[PDB]
Scaffold this active site. Sequence first.
Site, PDB file in Angstrom:
ATOM      1  N   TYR A 128      -0.610  -3.645  -8.498  1.00 29.82           N
ATOM      2  CA  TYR A 128       0.609  -3.166  -7.586  1.00 29.82           C
ATOM      3  C   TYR A 128       0.457  -3.863  -6.406  1.00 29.82           C
ATOM      4  O   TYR A 128      -0.568  -4.133  -5.749  1.00 29.82           O
ATOM      5  CB  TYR A 128       0.304  -1.571  -7.399  1.00 29.82           C
ATOM      6  CG  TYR A 128       1.556  -0.954  -6.827  1.00 29.82           C
ATOM      7  CD1 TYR A 128       3.014  -0.861  -7.393  1.00 29.82           C
ATOM      8  CD2 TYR A 128       1.601  -0.634  -5.641  1.00 29.82           C
ATOM      9  CE1 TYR A 128       4.152  -0.532  -6.936  1.00 29.82           C
ATOM     10  CE2 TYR A 128       2.812  -0.130  -4.708  1.00 29.82           C
ATOM     11  CZ  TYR A 128       3.967   0.044  -5.597  1.00 29.82           C
ATOM     12  OH  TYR A 128       5.197   0.337  -4.913  1.00 29.82           O
ATOM     13  N   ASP A 153      -4.355  -9.786  -2.858  1.00 27.33           N
ATOM     14  CA  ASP A 153      -3.700  -8.665  -2.096  1.00 27.33           C
ATOM     15  C   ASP A 153      -4.688  -7.915  -1.724  1.00 27.33           C
ATOM     16  O   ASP A 153      -5.331  -7.260  -2.375  1.00 27.33           O
ATOM     17  CB  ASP A 153      -2.769  -7.999  -3.264  1.00 27.33           C
ATOM     18  CG  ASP A 153      -2.123  -6.688  -2.515  1.00 27.33           C
ATOM     19  OD1 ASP A 153      -2.394  -6.144  -1.548  1.00 27.33           O
ATOM     20  OD2 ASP A 153      -1.027  -6.215  -3.339  1.00 27.33           O
ATOM     21  N   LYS A 179      -2.583  -0.702   5.217  1.00 27.23           N
ATOM     22  CA  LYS A 179      -3.565   0.443   5.481  1.00 27.23           C
ATOM     23  C   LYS A 179      -4.420   0.344   6.576  1.00 27.23           C
ATOM     24  O   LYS A 179      -3.929   0.946   7.699  1.00 27.23           O
ATOM     25  CB  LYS A 179      -4.118   0.787   3.988  1.00 27.23           C
ATOM     26  CG  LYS A 179      -3.031   0.726   2.860  1.00 27.23           C
ATOM     27  CD  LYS A 179      -3.624   1.119   1.789  1.00 27.23           C
ATOM     28  CE  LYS A 179      -2.840   1.067   0.630  1.00 27.23           C
ATOM     29  NZ  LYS A 179      -2.082   2.106  -0.134  1.00 27.23           N
TER      30      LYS A 179
HETATM   31  C1  LIG Z   1      -2.880  -3.376  -3.416  1.00 23.97           C
HETATM   32  C2  LIG Z   1      -1.722  -2.725  -2.911  1.00 23.97           C
HETATM   33  N1  LIG Z   1      -0.782  -3.556  -2.311  1.00 23.97           N
HETATM   34  C3  LIG Z   1       0.320  -2.953  -1.727  1.00 23.97           C
HETATM   35  C4  LIG Z   1       0.368  -1.460  -1.559  1.00 23.97           C
HETATM   36  C5  LIG Z   1       1.885  -0.845  -1.290  1.00 23.97           C
HETATM   37  O1  LIG Z   1       1.887  -1.222   0.220  1.00 23.97           O
HETATM   38  P1  LIG Z   1       2.457  -0.072   1.030  1.00 23.97           P
HETATM   39  O2  LIG Z   1       2.458   1.217   0.249  1.00 23.97           O
HETATM   40  O3  LIG Z   1       1.591  -0.287   2.408  1.00 23.97           O
HETATM   41  O4  LIG Z   1       4.060  -0.414   1.415  1.00 23.97           O
HETATM   42  C6  LIG Z   1      -0.493  -0.547  -2.196  1.00 23.97           C
HETATM   43  C7  LIG Z   1      -0.352   0.659  -2.377  1.00 23.97           C
HETATM   44  N2  LIG Z   1      -1.402   1.691  -2.658  1.00 23.97           N
HETATM   45  C8  LIG Z   1      -1.704  -1.441  -2.641  1.00 23.97           C
HETATM   46  O5  LIG Z   1      -2.763  -0.259  -3.233  1.00 23.97           O
HETATM   47  N1  LIG Z   2      -1.565   4.507  -3.264  1.00 18.53           N
HETATM   48  C1  LIG Z   2      -0.630   4.818  -2.989  1.00 18.53           C
HETATM   49  C2  LIG Z   2       0.599   4.217  -3.345  1.00 18.53           C
HETATM   50  C3  LIG Z   2       1.887   4.457  -2.824  1.00 18.53           C
HETATM   51  C4  LIG Z   2       2.009   5.568  -2.139  1.00 18.53           C
HETATM   52  C5  LIG Z   2       1.189   6.436  -1.552  1.00 18.53           C
HETATM   53  C6  LIG Z   2       1.578   7.551  -0.987  1.00 18.53           C
HETATM   54  O1  LIG Z   2       0.721   8.622  -0.620  1.00 18.53           O
HETATM   55  O2  LIG Z   2       2.748   7.788  -0.689  1.00 18.53           O
HETATM   56  C7  LIG Z   2      -0.252   5.825  -2.069  1.00 18.53           C
END
Ligand SMILES: Cc1ncc(COP(=O)(O)O)c(CN)c1O
Ligand SMILES: Nc1cccc(C(=O)O)c1
Lengths: 427, 427
Positions: free
Chosen positions: A144, A239, A267
């Site tokens: 993802y 990523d 994050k």
């Molecule tokens: C590997 C990775 N890259 C990007 C994202 C998505 O980015 P965000 O939700 O900060 O927009 C996630 C969400 N869990 C992720 O784990």
């Molecule tokens: N791991 C992941 C991916 C997308 C959204 C969220 C979330 O808490 O809203 C977390």
Amino acid sequence: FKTIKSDEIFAAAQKLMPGGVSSPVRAFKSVGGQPIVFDRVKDAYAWDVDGNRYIDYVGTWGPAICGHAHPEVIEALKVAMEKGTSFGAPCALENVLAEMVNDAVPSIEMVRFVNSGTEACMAVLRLMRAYTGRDKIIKFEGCYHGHADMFLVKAGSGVATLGLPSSPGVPKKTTANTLTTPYNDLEAVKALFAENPGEIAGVILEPIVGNSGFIVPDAGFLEGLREITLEHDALLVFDEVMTGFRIAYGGVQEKFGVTPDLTTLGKIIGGGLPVGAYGGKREIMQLVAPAGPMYQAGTLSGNPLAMTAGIKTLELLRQPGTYEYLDQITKRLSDGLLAIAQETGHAACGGQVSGMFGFFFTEGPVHNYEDAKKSDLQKFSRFHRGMLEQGIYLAPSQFEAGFTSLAHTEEDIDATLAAARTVMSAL
Amino acid sequence: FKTIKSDEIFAAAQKLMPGGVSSPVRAFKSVGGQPIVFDRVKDAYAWDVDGNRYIDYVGTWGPAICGHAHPEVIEALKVAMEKGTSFGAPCALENVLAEMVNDAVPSIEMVRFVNSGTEACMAVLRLMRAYTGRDKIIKFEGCYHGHADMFLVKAGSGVATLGLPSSPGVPKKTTANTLTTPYNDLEAVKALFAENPGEIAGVILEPIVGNSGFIVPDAGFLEGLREITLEHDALLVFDEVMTGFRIAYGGVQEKFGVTPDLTTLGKIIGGGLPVGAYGGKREIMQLVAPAGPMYQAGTLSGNPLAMTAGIKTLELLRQPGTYEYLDQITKRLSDGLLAIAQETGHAACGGQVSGMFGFFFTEGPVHNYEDAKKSDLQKFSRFHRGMLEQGIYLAPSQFEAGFTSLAHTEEDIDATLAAARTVMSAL
Ligand SMILES: Cc1ncc(COP(=O)(O)O)c(CN)c1O
Ligand SMILES: Nc1cccc(C(=O)O)c1
Ligand SMILES: Cc1ncc(COP(=O)(O)O)c(CN)c1O
């Protein structure tokens, strides 16, 4: 165990937002039943709207490495906001953070802040193309990188958890430049290259997977990827939005020793506020406006509050013993969870690297998404509810990595194991 | 007027980040190339890293309608941050914020919060295409709808400012499912539809453009658009990221009585914190995960701090005589500028609707982008630098609308018109 409050609130939410959630993963749609409305969170704990307290293993999905509501982060944010939340102009804080990130990450020599992982990945997508002059991209199956149109093909995270097809809304015209492939499969990569000469711009991947369960790269698999992409004048992109600053100060690329050309962050860098970043080799970043032709804007990118939270967060991870403690406590949890699984008569597997882990209900091992799909989703479902009513909060999915923080204590770990014993004894 | 510190700081920045900034327009490339660095903002003023105070007309690009650093907005945030800043699970604040937004804007029967207008813009396109099952989208010249692939073609903001072209990382394979027309040309649109049958998803536009200079819709323009899309079973989408809550509480759609099928919000709704949202008719919103098959997620989406600063902002706007006061000062200022120009022998034209205005160095009138481009950008560059020295802060681009706040006093409006005169009597 009462969840009456989380119940009324969630019911109302459904008439207001699609499925009562701001994101698909917050939906307990596969893990059976309805979600838990939180009230507040501090250190390694979280309190729902009914009073039940839990030991958190989700950590707002990643930012919380220092623990929730960290006193030093929340006071720095107190003083800072007296100056205003947003300028819409440069501010010295940007320099301080940009500087720290260059130091922290090996591959990164020039950075650009943005507002989230999705924007960072989307920007790096474009840049890959612009830089190489090629249209195609190689992304692995189950990974993802946001919901940017081209990444909406064979995605993991909530797409897997929910059991959804690829896309609905993204033209065939664009999805065709996304070449997919099984994680850990070096031969598939080669076959794609030899079969599409002069068209592959690059390979993008989660250096260590977290959105199709927890998966570590096979020995040599990363090096191979550095080796072959170099040979075809292609870009290697990691990523590290979720592994960044978690697997190591500088991430997987520092730990496992392989340096890409571009990396994405998110994050943990926000410190709990919306923040994303992308950066890498100077000569590639030069193509970004207003220095080069590739345009990418952001009203709130670099706002003072997000910059502050992140700065502080990084200063704390920088203290000695940080990544040791994370390894130490996460190893016990993983080993213990596996120890119990055997001792109670259940096929299981997983592992850990620093403060990130996974645990599947199958014999394993898991090297890819298809392997992951063989977990007893029915068992995990009853095990989650069980872990819940005992005061342990887990990602409501078999396809997410669990997280650990500097606020978790050896006691919190033990209390977790104890509950895992209790829960598995029935099943 | 010394800018020592802002110079050394911006200089250092160029070594750390692309162009030394985080969003292109901050580079000041269109107005000389030497930006000033902010240290703090309060009420209607800003302050250099050098000690200079400015009266702000940029207001962080829209968000600071209630004024910079609102006492009630920041105290509210200080209270909420003790409960943690990011949960990862649902929270009661999202429901209350949601409910308020459904009430405020006509079209919106169901909303989804995201982290930026860009994100909401990616999303609505995918949803509009998914809903109809068609891939052709129609857009206008000079309208910015998020730095995304499909839309980086004759966009607004930096694009419609420093002459940024089409593509910047987006292939002909992305910017091909999209059609274009001159803003305000009802015929061109009827043409495009006749010229492309059963394959157009809908039309997306800024109801009032602020990204190619302030430009209002002509006579029965919008009314026309609604009627034509209806006839073709196409969707009408309003990007109200800029107009929403600033033009009117229910934005432009409420103001001119025209109701689109979906709409995008951002800026103001997060009180100076990374936030955005998209909503519209129920039946269409159903397709959004997890309620439906179309994917869109976001880690920091719907976080408590952003929901807190959003609600306090909407509460303050709901007080008595809000939009009245803005129309009142924005007119006095808009006219004041236009008067000083006539008396100093400089051809110009502009206008305002609520707390938003425009001022172009040309006799106009501006009805579209080409019209906007006949402006004397050399005069503007010089004019701008002048105002900057009198202590008035203006958008560093001729194609960027100015903004007003409920903190701007009659006296601030008088002193700007004063600078406006000392300065225009040069050039
Ligand atoms: C590997 C990775 N890259 C990007 C994202 C998505 O980015 P965000 O939700 O900060 O927009 C996630 C969400 N869990 C992720 O784990
Ligand atoms: N791991 C992941 C991916 C997308 C959204 C969220 C979330 O808490 O809203 C977390
Ligand atoms: C009308 C419009 N749409 C979308 C955006 C994207 O905004 P953001 O910085 O929130 O991603 C903007 C930003 N200036 C805008 O003006």
